Specification:
Chain lengths: ~100, ~140, ~350, ~100, ~170, ~300, ~70, ~100, ~170, ~70
């Protein structure tokens, strides 16, 4: 709850900074007066590589176990599949401009 | 639903009159709520007031079916006094069908409603009298 | 697309349904359903019209919410007695949600609103593969989880599926909606037995799959989607007429023909219980869903509709189509009356 | 169906994700380990319906180990009796900060 | 339902080893070295019967061996043992590789004045046999008997009696 | 005392970012032939202070809830993102903190997209959408490279990292991985050569440069530094601060020199040059400890 | 050849191929297996004496059981 | 029954009704599907963490990465729908009439 | 600021789910779902929760709402309220307040269950010697045990990539 | 040693709790005083409400939720 106290203090002080930015000047003086496809490919590309990152990233917590051969095997299989997806969109001229 | 149909069959046949009609109006109001829910959720009647009108009309007709069915059920059971025939409830289902034809204002269609609702009421009383297991045994 | 890419995607449909078949775990079953969805999307929209776009949209929304409701049922099952084994559940509510999720998954009459709409605006290969494998996948799960189901759900969905698949179609002339309504009716027949003896359900599944393959192969004999095209198939070739005749009449369920065998044996192992009102209701509606079959027959197989020239132009050219396996499946799916004791092949 | 390539090749590719009480990697237990061991050893060569009939006691014991339902029921009852007697004022409680 | 068995404070009163974290952590190798020969009796008690309210005697025994151990280290060398654990104390989570000089000083202390060669790696490992007085009991899981055996349907098979015994298709 | 810790963190962020602005302006000035600024007060300190004041008294004008909600998220990230940074004794001993770095960088991407939506249907919002796309194309590279540089460190705890950096620096076992990661820090700070891109401009500007100081402090901790000697942590604090300062001056110094990319050249370069090289260096870092028999002590 | 065309690709496939193949040559994977197996986490359980084993040393000081000595000797 | 589970399942049901009834767009429907996904994730995560169900702790992360790629598929489909029109309304989908 | 902090964060969690399942404009819905994901992360980290909850927070908040708001901003407009939206919010708020009423003022709440609504520190461990986590060796499986599962997972994701490019105009 | 301390302490909590339950429910119908709700009379591990009941806030916060958000 200590970090909740930190989040609360930072949020409240930042809101006070925003209200100093807005409601400070008391001198109320004079009030006066299409999308593309290739944007969308980048987001889903990021999304699927992020999902395979989520699959990869608990690797170093796993490094203390006995079945080292299967670990190294499926780890190389995961990075290889990720690079195969990248090479697939690379050779099928997908993310090009 | 289940508890109030069990209330209806708990009322003997037998003469515990117009509680039978209360239970039958409750059954008809439930069935009218079912079919009215389908008819308002599958149509968009444009607008909400007309939807409430269609639901009230459907529930009123179905409760009228149940009411007049239970009334002539009690009338057969008190006048002719044969408690365990399918014939009285054949007459009862015909009465419910003819009053449905009255509330929809169609005559030959009301006669068809008489025929089919009387045969279904005869089936219900007849199979319940002999004892025919609903929906399943479910054993083998 | 590429042919190698289609090899890979159909391989993944095979792999997804096999993972549904093979695991004793729940997560792999849900992954198999999801991979089935993900790989069956690009088989639809194989052409480039917005018809297939809206069909794929409807299919994705219904398919996705069915998978999510299934995962809800599994997590409720582990809120109660906790293991990931595919056996009897431990909640009426979880089994209730699970049968409803599988009912949205395959298509019952409360949930059948997406099936004709997705099967119309798609090419025929997509419709064939979705019908065969999407009715093949959940029946394995139902076969495994059967001893924990309240009979009111399966019974109500089965009765309602048979009667709505009967009553729909009598206004309909598009052949894909006709075949989808027939799919709803046969899935109701496949469902109504499962709490009594599931061997009949998987046998009816085999028979219906072979019949559907023969049906859509004879609809792929040439590019036809309406009945008047079938009248042109009458005047361009005589053998397609009698083959469509016999396959339609086997979908009808007549005793000297193979499609009667799933009906009658279901009636038998139904009525070795005291169920009589249910067979007579199901069989009167099985009389009902033969009328659209019979008006298709009366249209383009035994009456002779007037045709149009340039069929004269079409007479010069051979039928250079490919058939996956047409005649084998046809005569195996029609003349299979005296092999009724191949019931026991299924154990 | 229920196909058994799972048993024909004989690979435990799925028989570790399955229940509790299997071989956890660092050999740590679950919360109701012995209850699962007793209920499974009650229900091994058992035909799945007499499993309901004749493994009732340990299955209910496992369920009330997992959810801990009646224990929370009894705890709520004791707390509400505590509330009504502190409303009464008898023995302003020496459970807290004393034995 | 069934009543419980809670042995009261009649047996639940032994004076605790009320020393703190860092001193107990820095005294650990000699604590496991000389004593903690009979605490494996306690641990074997605990794993052979997983019902504490049973092993109270050997819990008392390991408590008094720990108390005697600290008495023996208090009367003899060292007083710079106190220097050693206050050296290791304030280093956050206690890396044993921080304080080494006074580790050597305490080593020479204990070896010259009393002995106790420090247990090397991996001597606080290596699964160990020990004896008790009681034999290990059956079903510490208070388990009932087996529910039922399955009557094994076995024996050689006859051919099909009168075929399928369906409506027809005989033989 | 804990709120006093919070105040001693987030009161020098204002002075830190403002004096960072004077430092970068003076440094760019001496990179060119400029003494800018020195006239306005003693060596230009009151000029950033009073200029921040003037920026607070600008009186601007104007969807309003969205326009509220974007810079508040940006600056609360700028506040709440110096928590586990282990200037010797960190504020919160998080068991994992690097994944918290990644999550709050994604929250900064939220901030940029909310500002772009609040910009009210402009060719600027199309450009801000492109900036959101380029900013989101980097957390793949940063997470995977960060994963590899913690792989030689066992745990996510970052105190284990300050243990690992005692013998030699971690810049020597992974220098090209570190080079790619530093280019990704240039990338995440959304400054030169990686550009382009209303109010409150002081708060948004504050968020960007506190994000810069965070990335430089995290760079300095991740790859090099000094030894944590207890009962005098200020020595480590001084040496860490000097190295982080030199790295931040180098960071602005590399910004002082090169023209900015093309957007499609930026994407082309990112994917087709960093991303296979990340995967190859990362699989080599996976197979490295099994071929040196040195897996770190995951406790 | 392709060394001027996409050189970062060539270096990537080179370090990838050595990262795949290179675990086949090692005097150290057995050392990795011994380290990662012989680190105790849980409690080393006791057991009943009367199996009459010429192993399982009754004293933790006693080196009659299988242990490690190559650790301190690197 | 660990009363946080009560209103988690309640909010699940409300998320499911949000997936079902919707009147203007489809992205909001897909977003409520994502919220339902979050509900399943949270419920399974709290259960497996309560039970010390340490061996099969794969369930919440694998559940969310799979239903994540499901949502990605839904995004691509809605982009194709919005690209063959100007908008993404529930309306202008009434073609292929029944 | 009491015992029921997990319960209060659960209440705010249900508030956020009602906030976007009251059918607002979809970018407001994305805002409410960001709120919901943050407070669900708070709930799971209250159960500790150290690894998996803040883990998939990256994937859920760090990977999904950004793409949803991306596509929502670029595709359609709704460029400048209705009684149905605020009425759904009224009904959700009323059912939430009714649940608060029946929890806090009664014994138990049963829709079709048995919820004992009280201090949910139960259930919890009695401080065992875990020394890593549950989540640590938990997700530090999938590699010594997960042969089949991560293979079919990565295979499904590769098929997901090729499906996406096909739909968005393969090749 | 710590294990034996933990065992003595949890038995002490159970003994205190059952004595105070015997007082606090002295005139209620039903309520057998020592109900193991589980039929199998064995050792079962308590669930921190069986241990840390009747404490009102402080020590239950430091015990149930102490490690979970310490620092």
């Amino acid at each position: 709850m200590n970090l909740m106290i930190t989040l609360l203090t930072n949020f409240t002080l930042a809101t006070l900074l925003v209200t100093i930015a807005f409601w400070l000047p008391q001198l109320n003086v004079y009030s006066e007066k299409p999308f593309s496809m290739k944007f969308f490919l980048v987001a889903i590309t990021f999304l699927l590589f992020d999902l395979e990152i989520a699959l990869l990233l608990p690797l170093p917590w796993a490094s203390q176990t006995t079945n080292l051969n299967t670990m190294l095997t499926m780890a190389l299989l995961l990075i290889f599949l990720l690079a195969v997806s990248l090479a697939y969109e690379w050779t099928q001229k997908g993310l090009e401009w | 639903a289940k508890t109030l149909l069990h209330q209806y069959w708990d009322i003997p046949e037998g003469t515990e009159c117009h509680r039978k009609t209360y239970a039958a109006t409750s059954i008809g109001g439930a069935s009218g709520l079912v079919v009215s829910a389908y008819s308002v959720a599958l149509k968009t009647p444009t607008s909400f007031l007309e939807g409430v009108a269609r639901t009230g009309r459907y529930t009123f007709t179905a409760a009228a079916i149940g009411a007049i069915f239970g009334l002539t059920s009690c009338i057969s059971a008190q006048v002719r006094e044969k408690p365990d025939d399918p014939l009285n409830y054949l007459i009862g289902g015909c009465a419910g069908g003819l009053t449905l034809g009255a509330r929809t204002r169609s005559y030959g269609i009301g006669a068809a409603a008489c025929a089919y609702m009387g045969l279904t009421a005869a089936l219900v009383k007849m199979g319940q009298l002999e004892g025919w297991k609903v929906f399943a045994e479910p054993k083998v | 697309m590429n042919p190698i890419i289609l090899i890979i995607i159909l391989m993944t449909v095979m792999l997804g349904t096999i993972i549904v078949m093979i695991s004793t775990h729940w997560l792999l079953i849900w992954i198999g359903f999801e991979m089935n969805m993900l790989a069956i999307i690009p088989i639809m929209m194989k052409k480039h019209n917005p018809r297939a776009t809206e069909a794929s949209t409807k299919y994705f929304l219904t398919q996705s919410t069915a998978s999510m409701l299934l995962m809800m049922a599994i997590i409720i099952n582990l809120m109660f007695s906790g293991q990931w084994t595919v056996m009897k559940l431990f909640n009426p509510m979880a089994s209730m949600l699970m049968t409803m999720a599988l009912a949205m998954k395959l298509g019952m009459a409360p949930f059948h609103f997406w099936v004709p709409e997705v099967t119309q605006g798609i090419p025929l290969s997509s419709g064939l593969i979705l019908l065969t494998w999407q009715k093949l996948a959940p029946m394995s799960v139902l076969y495994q989880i059967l001893p924990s189901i309240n009979l009111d759900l399966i019974l109500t969905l089965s009765i309602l599926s048979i009667t709505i698949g009967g009553w729909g179609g009598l206004n309909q002339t598009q052949l894909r909606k006709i075949m989808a309504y027939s799919s709803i009716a046969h899935m109701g027949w496949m469902t109504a037995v499962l709490l009594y003896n599931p061997t009949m359900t998987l046998l009816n599944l085999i028979i219906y799959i072979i019949m559907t393959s023969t049906m859509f192969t004879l609809f792929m004999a040439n590019s036809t989607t309406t009945t008047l095209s079938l009248s042109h198939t009458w005047n361009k070739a005589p053998i397609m007429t009698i083959l469509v005749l016999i396959t339609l009449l086997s979908m009808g369920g007549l005793p000297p023909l193979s499609g009667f065998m799933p009906k009658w044996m279901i009636i038998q192992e139904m009525t070795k219980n005291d169920s009589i009102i249910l067979p007579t209701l199901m069989a009167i509606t099985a009389l009902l869903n033969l009328y659209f079959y019979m008006r298709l027959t009366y249209s383009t197989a035994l009456t002779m509709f007037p045709s149009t020239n340039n069929m004269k132009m079409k007479w010069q050219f051979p039928t250079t189509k490919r058939m996956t396996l047409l005649p084998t499946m046809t005569v195996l799916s029609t003349m299979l009356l005296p092999l009724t004791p191949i019931l026991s092949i299924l154990e | 169906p229920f196909f058994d390539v799972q048993k024909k090749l004989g690979v435990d590719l799925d028989h570790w994700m399955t229940i509790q009480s299997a071989e956890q990697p660092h050999r740590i237990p679950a919360r109701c380990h012995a209850f699962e061991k007793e209920w499974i050893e009650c229900a091994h060569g058992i035909g799945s319906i007499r499993a309901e009939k004749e493994c009732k006691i340990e299955f209910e014991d496992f369920r009330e180990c997992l959810l801990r339902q009646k224990t929370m029921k009894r705890l709520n009852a004791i707390k509400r009796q505590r509330d009504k007697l502190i409303k009464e004022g008898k023995y302003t409680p020496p459970p807290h900060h004393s034995g | 339902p069934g009543i419980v068995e809670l042995p009261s404070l009649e047996d639940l009163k032994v004076q605790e080893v009320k020393v703190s974290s860092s001193v107990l952590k820095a005294a650990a190798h000699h604590y496991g070295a000389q004593c903690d020969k009979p605490n494996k009796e306690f641990m074997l008690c605990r794993w052979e019967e997983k019902d504490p309210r049973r092993c109270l005697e050997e819990g008392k025994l390991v408590n008094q061996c720990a108390l005697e151990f600290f008495r023996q280290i208090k009367r003899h060398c060292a007083e710079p043992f106190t220097e050693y654990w206050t050296c290791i104390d304030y280093s956050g989570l206690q890396l044993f590789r921080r304080c080494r000089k006074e580790q050597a000083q305490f080593d020479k202390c204990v070896l010259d004045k009393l002995g106790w060669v420090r247990p090397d790696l991996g001597e606080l490992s290596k699964v160990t046999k020990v004896k008790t007085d009681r034999p290990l009991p059956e079903n510490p899981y208070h388990s009932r008997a087996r529910p039922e055996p399955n009557p094994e349907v076995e024996g050689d098979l006859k051919p099909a009696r009168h075929g399928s015994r369906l409506f027809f298709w005989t033989m | 005392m804990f709120m006093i810790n919070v105040l001693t963190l987030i009161i020098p962020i204002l002075l830190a970012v403002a004096f960072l602005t004077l430092v970068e302006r003076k440094v760019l000035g001496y990179m060119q032939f400029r003494k800018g600024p020195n006239v306005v007060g003693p060596y230009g300190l009151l000029q950033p202070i009073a200029d921040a004041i003037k920026l607070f008294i600008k009186e601007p004008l104007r969807s309003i809830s969205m326009f509220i909600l974007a810079p508040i998220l940006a600056l609360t990230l700028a506040l709440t993102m110096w928590i586990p940074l282990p200037m010797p004794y960190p504020l919160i001993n998080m068991n994992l903190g690097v994944l918290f770095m990644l999550a709050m960088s994604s929250l900064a991407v939220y901030s940029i997209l909310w500002s772009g939506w609040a910009s009210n249907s402009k060719y600027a919002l199309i450009g801000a959408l492109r900036a959101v796309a380029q900013t989101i194309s980097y957390e793949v590279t940063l997470a995977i490279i960060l994963l590899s540089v913690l792989l030689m460190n066992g745990s996510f705890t970052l105190s284990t990292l300050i243990i690992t950096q005692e013998q030699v620096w971690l810049i020597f076992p992974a220098w090209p991985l570190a080079m790619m990661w530093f280019i990704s820090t240039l990338a995440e700070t959304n400054r030169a050569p990686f550009d382009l891109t209303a109010g409150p401009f002081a708060l948004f500007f504050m968020a960007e440069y506190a994000n810069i100081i965070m990335m430089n402090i995290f760079t300095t901790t991740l790859f090099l530094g000094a030894f944590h000697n207890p009962y005098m942590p200020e020595l480590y604090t001084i040496n860490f601060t000097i190295k982080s300062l030199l790295l931040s001056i180098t960071f602005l110094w590399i910004r002082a020199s090169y023209p900015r990319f093309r957007y499609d050249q930026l994407m082309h370069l990112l994917w087709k040059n960093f991303l296979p090289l990340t995967l190859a260096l990362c699989m080599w870092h996976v197979s490295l400890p099994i071929l040196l028999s040195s897996i770190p002590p995951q406790t | 050849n392709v060394w001027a065309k996409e050189p970062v690709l060539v270096a990537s496939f080179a370090i990838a191929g050595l990262a795949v193949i290179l675990p086949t040559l090692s005097p150290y994977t057995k050392y990795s297996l011994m380290i990662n197996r012989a680190t105790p986490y849980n409690y080393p359980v006791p057991l009943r004496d009367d199996g009459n084993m010429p192993d399982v040393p009754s004293h933790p000081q006693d080196p009659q059981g299988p242990s490690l000595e190559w650790l301190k000797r690197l | 029954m660990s009363l946080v589970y009560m209103n988690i399942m309640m909010a699940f049901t409300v998320s499911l009704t949000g997936l079902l009834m919707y009147r203007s767009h489809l992205m909001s429907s897909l977003l409520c599907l994502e919220g339902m996904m979050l509900s399943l994730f949270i419920l399974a995560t709290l259960m497996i963490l309560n039970s010390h169900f340490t061996l099969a702790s794969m369930m919440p992360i694998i559940l969310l990465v799979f239903a994540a790629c499901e949502a990605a598929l839904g995004l691509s489909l809605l982009v194709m729908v919005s690209n063959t029109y100007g908008t993404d309304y529930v309306q202008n989908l009434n073609l292929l009439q029944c | 600021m009491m015992t029921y902090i997990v319960f209060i964060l659960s209440i705010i969690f249900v508030m956020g789910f009602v906030g976007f399942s009251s059918k607002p404009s979809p970018i407001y819905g994305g805002l409410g779902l960001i709120v919901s994901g943050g407070v669900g992360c708070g709930i799971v980290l209250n159960f500790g929760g150290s690894f998996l909850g803040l883990m998939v927070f990256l994937i859920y908040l760090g990977g999904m709402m950004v793409v949803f708001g991306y596509t929502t901003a670029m595709a359609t407009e709704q460029y400048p309220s209705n009684k149905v939206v605020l009425g759904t919010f009224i009904t959700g708020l009323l059912m939430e307040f009714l649940m608060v009423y029946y929890v806090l003022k009664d014994k138990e709440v049963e829709i079709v269950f048995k919820f004992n609504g009280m201090g949910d520190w139960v259930i919890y461990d009695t401080g065992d010697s875990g020394f890593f986590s549950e989540e640590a060796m938990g997700i530090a499986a999938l590699y010594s045990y997960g042969t089949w599962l991560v293979i079919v997972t990565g295979w499904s994701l590769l098929i997901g990539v090729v499906v996406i490019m096909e739909i968005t105009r393969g090749n | 040693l710590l294990q034996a301390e933990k065992d003595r302490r949890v038995l002490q909590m159970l003994r205190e709790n059952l004595e105070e339950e015997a007082t606090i429910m002295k005139d209620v119908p039903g309520w057998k005083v020592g109900e193991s709700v589980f039929h199998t009379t064995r050792w079962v591990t308590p669930m921190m409400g069986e241990l840390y009941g009747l404490r009102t806030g402080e020590e239950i916060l430091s015990s149930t939720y102490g490690f979970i958000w310490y620092t």
